[PDB]
């Protein structure tokens, strides 16, 4: 699992304790925590396996960020804020909601100014409501001068070298994430390479390798929850998802100053520690390296995941309707391949 | 079913009787028998539905063909002859046998001269052996002068008009089929448009529309028995093939002078009547019309069959190995689309 909690310097006590972690049905083994100068860390990144780097200084300027500082300096732009009644903030793609009319999300998106977010958050705490908020917004040019300055002070030298060494594509975005204690982002995989930079508070990250596809049961590609697991971690339905009983995860708790490499196609479940206050994270999403000219057989798991996504997409467009994908695939396999 | 047997002219009695038909688990309704001048016959062909045409004169010159005439005139070329110990002559593609080493066929192919075929056939009858033979050979330029003459006398005017009216591609081949009484070609579909011209003896043809794909369980595309049904008609395994209990067929008995239109992708099971002597048939296989510029949704069943074949092919080549197609498809659908 996460292991013995780290001791904060100056004898300030344990950073967190196991009682701040939610309880799940599967075993986990810890993600390595290493210096960015450790050759083993380069070896993990090169091999597209997760690693927590403890001393990158990737977002050193931002470690002073809290709500007051951000409210004062982050500008007058609109911020996407998600609202839910449960701790689970399952992501949904708005463009695809037309395909499935029977999908009604359990979280709602609302655009607001930063001070409005701080206000709603302040308001909920005052009256101890159960509503939960999660701000997720990509950093853009509308931020104010001091945030620009902080952003410019990130460790571009280090990360640019990484981008170059791995042959990755361009940085596509930086997502600012601000959450309430207890918030969960359920298990999903992203199609970009991600350096997850923790800034404030603590997040437990549980990762699963691409080869566990069969255990995690993603939604259909056309569904709004494409790339998310259908399994409810709190109450797993083993009758529909029997192989979730075989899932094994790589887990860690990141705190201020840590950077977690989440390789492309790796599943990740991310939770802000219970009773840990608000969390702040900034991610760094890069397009993956181009497909190689020469393909080595047999293919890696993430290549097979890519093939399956493309089959699902092609069939949706060929049949003229994504709801026909399932019946055709079943008709294709029943009594033939199963 | 086939209906009341036809009465042969000059009061020569029933052409056949129901006791010459094998018994199967499913219901059937008869294929219409009509004149080629009947507008309903054009309407069936145009709509790619089967019809028996009784007066095309398509192979009128060949109606005098028997073994002695063919032996005397069909030349010194090699003829492919299949040999089996059962009545079922399941087709297998030799090129694909490398993909599945665990497939050992129940019929063997042997090349021989026509007189050798007649000899083996004569020999088996003399000693009442149980071996069965089925000659299946495409007509080629090596045939002798009188067969050329007969071939030239086929009703090209009529069939060429059909080829033109339907927009079909080229005639790809004429298959000569000579079988022993009781021989069965198990259910399969072909990817070409077929005019089946009966010459000698009687064959019961049972056809199933493309939309019955789900009931007939074809082998995987990479398997040597691609396009053949896995179901054993004599002993259907309803546990593996439950929807074979829903299959309904269109059936007819063709005799000398009849021509049966077997539309592309229609399943057909063909049996030479028990105790009916040898059968002779010549087929006429045409490439189907090009795919239309504008596609109408939803697609026809045979278009979906074409899509499924292409998915199976693409995955075989992408994974580098056809035996991985099944596991990927299952992993793609379990807990997702089923």
């Amino acid at each position: 699992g996460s292991g013995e909690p780290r001791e904060e310097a100056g004898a300030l006590g344990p950073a967190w304790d196991e009682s701040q972690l939610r309880s799940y049905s599967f075993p986990t083994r810890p993600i390595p925590r290493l210096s960015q100068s450790d050759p083993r860390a380069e070896e993990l990144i090169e091999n597209e396996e997760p690693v927590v780097l403890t001393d990158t200084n990737l977002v050193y300027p931002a470690l002073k960020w809290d709500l007051e500082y951000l409210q004062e300096n982050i500008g007058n732009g609109d911020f996407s804020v998600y609202s839910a009644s449960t701790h689970k903030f399952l992501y949904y793609d708005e463009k695809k909601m037309a395909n499935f009319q029977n999908f009604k999300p359990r979280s709602n998106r609302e655009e607001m100014k930063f001070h409005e977010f701080v206000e709603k958050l302040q308001d909920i705490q005052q009256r101890g409501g159960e509503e939960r908020l999660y701000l997720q917004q990509t950093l853009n040019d509308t931020v104010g001068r001091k945030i620009v300055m902080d952003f410019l002070g990130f460790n571009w030298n280090w990360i640019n070298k990484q981008q170059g060494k791995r042959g990755w594509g361009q940085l596509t975005s930086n997502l600012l994430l601000i959450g309430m204690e207890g918030n969960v982002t359920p298990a999903h995989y992203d199609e970009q390479q991600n350096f997850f930079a923790q800034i404030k508070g603590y997040k437990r990250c549980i990762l699963f390798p691409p080869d566990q596809f069969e255990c995690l049961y993603p939604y259909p590609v056309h569904h709004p929850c494409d790339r998310q697991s259908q399994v409810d971690f709190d109450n797993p339905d083993y009758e529909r998802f029997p192989n979730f009983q075989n899932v094994v995860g790589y887990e860690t708790v990141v705190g201020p100053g840590d950077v977690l490499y989440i390789p492309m196609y790796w599943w990740h479940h991310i939770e802000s520690l219970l009773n840990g206050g608000i969390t702040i994270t900034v991610n760094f999403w890069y397009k993956g390296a181009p497909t190689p000219k020469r393909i080595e057989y047999p293919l890696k798991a993430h290549q097979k995941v890519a093939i399956m996504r493309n089959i699902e997409k092609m069939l949706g467009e060929a049949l003229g309707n994504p709801q026909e994908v399932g019946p055709l695939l079943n008709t294709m396999i029943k009594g033939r391949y199963n | 079913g086939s209906g009341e047997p036809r009465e042969e002219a000059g009061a020569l009695g029933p052409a056949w009787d129901e006791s010459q038909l094998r018994s199967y688990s499913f219901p059937t309704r008869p294929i219409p028998r009509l004149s080629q001048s009947d507008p309903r016959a054009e309407e069936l062909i145009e709509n790619e539905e089967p019809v028996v045409l009784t007066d095309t004169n398509l192979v009128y010159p060949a109606l005098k063909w028997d073994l002695e005439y063919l032996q005397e005139n069909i030349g010194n070329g090699d003829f492919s002859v299949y040999s089996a110990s059962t009545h079922k002559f399941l087709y297998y593609d030799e090129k694909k046998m490398a993909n599945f080493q665990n497939f050992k066929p129940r019929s063997n192919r042997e090349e021989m001269k026509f007189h050798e075929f007649v000899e083996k056939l004569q020999d088996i009858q003399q000693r009442g052996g149980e071996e069965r033979l089925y000659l299946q050979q495409t007509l080629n330029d090596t045939v002798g002068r009188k067969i050329v003459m007969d071939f030239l006398g086929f009703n090209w005017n009529w069939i060429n008009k059909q080829q033109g009216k339907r927009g079909w591609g080229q005639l790809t081949s004429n298959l000569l089929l000579i079988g022993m009484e009781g021989n069965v070609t198990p259910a399969h579909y072909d990817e070409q448009q077929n005019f089946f011209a009966q010459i000698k003896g009687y064959k019961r043809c049972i056809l199933f529309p493309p939309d019955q794909f789900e009931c007939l369980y074809p082998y995987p595309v990479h398997h040597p028995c691609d396009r053949q049904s896995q179901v054993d008609f004599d002993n259907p395994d309803y546990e593996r093939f439950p929807n074979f209990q829903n299959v309904v067929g269109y059936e007819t008995v063709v005799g000398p002078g009849d021509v049966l239109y077997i539309p592309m992708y229609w399943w057909h099971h063909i049996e030479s009547l028990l105790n009916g002597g040898i059968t002779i048939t010549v087929n006429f296989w045409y490439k189907g019309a090009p795919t239309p510029k504008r596609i109408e949704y939803p697609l026809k069943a045979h278009q979906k069959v074409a899509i499924m074949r292409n998915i199976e092919k693409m995955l075989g080549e992408a994974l580098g190995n056809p035996q991985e197609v099944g596991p990927l498809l299952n992993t793609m659908i379990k807990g997702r689309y089923n």
Binding site: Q136, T172, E191, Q192 | -
Partner: peptide, 14 residues
């Protein structure tokens, strides 16, 4: 070939 191609979809709006 075409099948191996990947996108850039993540848990955020394009």
């Amino acid at each position: 070939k075409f099948l191996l191609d990947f996108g850039v979809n993540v848990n955020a709006a394009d």
